[PDB]
């Protein structure tokens, strides 16, 4: 519907792609005033100025961030930190936040898709996807959230990095 | 001469190792406030350690 | 319609101009019981007894303010400090408050248009404009507020003096 259209419109300019040996292997996001890219994917960002600045890298949270140049600041993402019970949109079908966990239906994310955001009902990004592990007919995700100030990480057992 | 050189080298290596490790400790403590979208370090910790 | 008429009705009574070399270089406002103006603008206030009184200047917050003459107290401005998020009025059009930041569309403020107050939905003043930094199709403003009893100051990166 129209919500899918608006998600498409926001992802058309808020998400960039990384390149490695002629293959697409990850996506980077522009949240608030920070450009974020997960550390487990190696490559060069397909852009003329994003790759030209220093990156603060941490392997504990498996991510790297930088300060967004002011000449493209407007393409923000309107961050949020509330995490109530329920359903949340995604590029590859709706996911559900229940019991402090993110679950998606079985096979919806292929390896190499790491780096998509997870939007809320109002269009605000709440987490960035890192990996997933399947049980039964569902897949529990492994993401990082932005509660208060600390960027905590949650990972279920047997996860695989995409 | 040998004893003085050895003592000086040991003192320098101890000082360098401890200073580098203190710098690493500061960097690791202040690293997760710099990845959060928005937000800012508390002024207390911002004056205790040099915070950008 | 009527909101615009009421806004200009207040503005033509409270907002004063400052002259220099025969050209307009800024506007000085009147809020509550104080006459306030930005410090970067240099000129002569377009009134007789307003300039005849002694100001009080600070460069940390970048402004000057002084007491209200008794017989102009009737023309007030009805200040307030409540600061929710959404839309806000302004003589050059609507301004969006989000993420603790005020933002205007593309290019709507020429240099030398500083000092214009930002009114609220109920017609009360919330901040005095000082500068702005342009980006993409929007522009982040830099103003001064009145949080509780302290006048604070927020200037986005790359702010251009107005």
C89 DSSP 8-state letter: B
Q: Are A92 and A102 in contact (CB under 8 A)?
A: no
A28 DSSP 8-state letter: E
**Chain A residues with CB inside 8 Å of C107's CB?**
none
Interface of A with B (CB under 8 A): 31-34, 36, 56, 58, 61, 63, 65, 79, 146, 149-151
Which phi-psi region, left, alpha or beta, contains residue C91 (left: φ > 0; alpha: ψ -120 to 50)? alpha
End-to-end CA distance of chain C: 29
Among C43, C8, C10, CA closest to C27? C43
Q: String of b and e for C96-131 (b: at least 16 CB within 10 Å)? A: ebebeebbbeeebbeeebbbbbbbbeeeebbbbbbb
Q: At what resolution in Å was this solved?
A: 3.5
| Longest pairwise C-alpha distance within chain B | 57
A104 DSSP 8-state letter: E
- Ordered alpha helix ranges (H), chain A: 2-14
Report how far residue C101's alpha carbon sits from residue C94's, in angstroms, rounded to the nearest whole number: 14
Contacts of A61 by beta carbon, 8 Å cutoff, 6+ apart: A144, A151, A153, B32, B35
Q: Which chains touch B (3 or more CB pairs under 8 A)?
A: A
Q: Do C99 and A72 touch (CB under 8 A)?
A: no
Q: Do B35 and A151 touch (CB under 8 A)?
A: yes
Report how far residue B17's alpha carbon sits from residue C53's, in angstroms, rounded to the nearest whole number: 63
Q: How was this structure determined?
A: cryo-EM
Shortest distance between the Cα of C93 and any Cα of chain A, in A, equals 19
Report how far residue C162's alpha carbon sits from residue A41's, in angstroms, rounded to the nearest whole number: 44
Q: Are C131 and C139 in contact (CB under 8 A)?
A: no
Tokens of C58: 């600070």
**Chain A residues with CB inside 8 Å of C140's CB?**
73
**Chain B residues with CB inside 8 Å of A61's CB?**
32, 35
Report how far residue A35's alpha carbon sits from residue B37's, in angstroms, rounded to the nearest whole number: 9
Q: String of b and e for A24-49 (b: at least 16 CB within 10 Å)? A: ebbbbbbbbbbbbbbbebebebeeee
Contacts of A64 by beta carbon, 8 Å cutoff, 6+ apart: A36, A37, A38, A39, A55, A56, A57, A58
Shortest distance between the Cα of A133 and any Cα of chain B, in A, equals 25
User: Alpha carbon of C65 to those of A72, B50, C18, C28, C51: distances in Å?
Assistant: 36, 34, 14, 10, 12
Shortest distance between the Cα of A29 and any Cα of chain B, in A, equals 11
Report how far residue C38's alpha carbon sits from residue C61's, in angstroms, rounded to the nearest whole number: 9
Residue that has been written with the tokens 């002084």 in this structure: C66
**Chain A residues with CB inside 8 Å of B33's CB?**
149
Kindly report the backbone phi and psi dihedral angles of residue A78, in degrees, each rounded to the nearest multiple of 5, phi listed first.
55, 70
Q: Are A15 and A116 in contact (CB under 8 A)?
A: yes
User: Alpha carbon of A31 to those of A41, A52, C31: distances in Å?
Assistant: 19, 19, 37
Report how far residue B39's alpha carbon sits from residue A83's, in angstroms, rounded to the nearest whole number: 17
């Amino acid at each position: 519907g129209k919500r899918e259209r608006m998600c498409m419109k926001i992802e058309n300019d808020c998400i960039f792609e990384v390149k490695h040996e002629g293959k697409v292997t990850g996506y980077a996001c522009l949240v608030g005033d920070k450009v974020m890219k997960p550390a487990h994917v190696k490559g060069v960002i397909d852009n003329a100025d994003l790759a030209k600045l220093a990156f603060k890298k941490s392997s504990k949270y498996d991510l790297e961030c930088a300060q967004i140049p002011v000449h493209m600041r407007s393409d923000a993402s309107k961050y949020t930190h509330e995490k109530p019970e329920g359903h949340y949109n995604w590029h590859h079908g709706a996911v559900q936040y229940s019991g402090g966990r993110f679950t998606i239906p079985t096979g919806a994310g292929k390896p190499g898709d790491s780096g998509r955001p997870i939007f809320d009902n109002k269009g605000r990004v709440v987490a960035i996807v890192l990996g997933g592990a399947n049980e039964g007919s569902r897949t529990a995700l492994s993401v990082v959230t932005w509660n208060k100030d600390m960027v905590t990480r949650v990972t279920p057992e047997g996860s695989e990095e995409w | 001469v040998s004893a003085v050189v050895g003592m000086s080298l040991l003192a320098l290596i101890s000082i360098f190792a401890s200073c580098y490790m203190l710098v690493a400790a500061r960097s690791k403590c202040l690293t997760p406030y710099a990845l959060t979208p928005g937000a800012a370090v508390p002024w207390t910790l911002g004056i205790l350690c040099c915070a950008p």
